[PDB]
Amino acid sequence: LLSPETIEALRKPTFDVWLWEPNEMLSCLEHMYHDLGLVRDFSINPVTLRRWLFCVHDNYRNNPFHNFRHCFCVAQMMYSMVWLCSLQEKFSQTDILILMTAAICHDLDHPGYNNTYQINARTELAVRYNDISPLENHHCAVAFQILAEPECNIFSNIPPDGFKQIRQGMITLILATDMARHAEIMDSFKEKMENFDYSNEEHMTLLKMILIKCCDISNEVRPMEVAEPWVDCLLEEYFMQSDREKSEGLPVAPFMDRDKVTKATAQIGFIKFVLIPMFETVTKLFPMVEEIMLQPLWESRDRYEELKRIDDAMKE
Ligand SMILES: C[C@@H](Nc1nc2c(cnn2C2CCCC2)c(=O)[nH]1)C(=O)N1CC2(CC(F)C2)C1
Numbered sequence: 001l002l003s004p005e006t007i008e009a010l011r012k013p014t015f016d017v018w019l020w021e022p023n024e025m026l027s028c029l030e031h032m033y034h035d036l037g038l039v040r041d042f043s044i045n046p047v048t049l050r051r052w053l054f055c056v057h058d059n060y061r062n063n064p065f066h067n068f069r070h071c072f073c074v075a076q077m078m079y080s081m082v083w084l085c086s087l088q089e090k091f092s093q094t095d096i097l098i099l100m101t102a103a104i105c106h107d108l109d110h111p112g113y114n115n116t117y118q119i120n121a122r123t124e125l126a127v128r129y130n131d132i133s134p135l136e137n138h139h140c141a142v143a144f145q146i147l148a149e150p151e152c153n154i155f156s157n158i159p160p161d162g163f164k165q166i167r168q169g170m171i172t173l174i175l176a177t178d179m180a181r182h183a184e185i186m187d188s189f190k191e192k193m194e195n196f197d198y199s200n201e202e203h204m205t206l207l208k209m210i211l212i213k214c215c216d217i218s219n220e221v222r223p224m225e226v227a228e229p230w231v232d233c234l235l236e237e238y239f240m241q242s243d244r245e246k247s248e249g250l251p252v253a254p255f256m257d258r259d260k261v262t263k264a265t266a267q268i269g270f271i272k273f274v275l276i277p278m279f280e281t282v283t284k285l286f287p288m289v290e291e292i293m294l295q296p297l298w299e300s301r302d303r304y305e306e307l308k309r310i311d312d313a314m315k316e
């Protein structure tokens, strides 16, 4: 049971996601489907929405970074986007259905070891998936295995041609959050931004991919108090793989090695050449983004460059 107060905070990217527990994030997600009217426009049985979210919650794992709270941030930031950019004037409700759900489903059953560990260690997932985005294929699988158990099927009133359309949107969105395709997606998105056209099904599909990627690496857009502890979760998880990679003799990535990474190098380059330049492109479509999201990103940036200029000196 949420308050009037909480329900005005739910719609804003300043929302402190650390203050709630699974019970309340679940009610927070459920509020979103009513509030955006998908509940009404696809005839979602409200007890289906509640069980399904409980199966979506159950199938995340206890990992420092990619846990259920991370699922919440992505969907809550995608939530915030829709109000901020008035995405209902631009996007169909089925698209809204695709953005919100995929966000919730995009890291299902994430193991805590990323893509290049599954391939190097030659794991079930990377052999199941042929070295093609092993993790993101699995997420989208577990998403629809849940959806294929009738009790959790928030989709069970939707005509089959309509399922097709959602399932394919969702697949594209989830499969695009793999950071091994960052540059290729960004480049085709600016290949359509040169003259963007909202009636074009291919311009819109690239906007949804840019949208979900944004919400997925959006931890720094949040105010400093919310954003900062999420760095330690990330490093705790990255040291966990680089710790394990060395015990087995697999290679290690320098940004993941604890002999190399400090909190500041961890975020400087990432903010400067992924977050800002992406959110810079979206700002061309929705100019309000520069105020609300680019400005936090800038401030975190100056700060984290400065923290680095502190530690360099300590090392002297
Ligand atoms: C240490 C890290 N930092 C970093 N990652 C973040 C933040 C939020 N979500 N992620 C995701 C990016 C991929 C999975 C986690 C975040 O605030 N910082 C960093 O240096 N990058 C460069 C890359 C390698 C891949 F190509 C992107 C990670």
Ligand SMILES: [Mg+2]
Binding pocket: 106, 107, 177, 178
């Ligand atoms: Mg992921």
Ligand SMILES: [Zn+2]
Binding pocket: 106, 107, 177, 216
């Ligand atoms: Zn993610």
